[PDB]
Amino acid sequence: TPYPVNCKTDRDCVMCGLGISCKNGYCQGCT
């Protein structure tokens, strides 16, 4: 889930999935 998945860019949330939209320093919705 994109709850505790932080990031700056799209591929920064790679931990969540393959290309995740990054919100205010977090994950929007990976796979």
Swiss-Prot record:
Q: Which UniProt keywords apply?
A: Disulfide bond, Secreted, Signal
Question: Does the entry annotate any disulfide bonds, and if so which pairs?
Answer: 7-22, 13-27, 16-30
Q: Where in the cell is it found?
A: Secreted
Expressed in which tissues: Expressed by the venom gland.
A GO CC annotation recorded here is:
extracellular region
Q: From the UniProt record, list the coiled-coil ranges.
A: none
* Miscellaneous information on this protein: Negative results: does not show any effect on Na(+), Ca(2+) currents, nor on voltage-gated and calcium-activated potassium channels.
**Name of protein:** Neurotoxin BmP08
Q: Which organism is it from?
A: Olivierus martensii
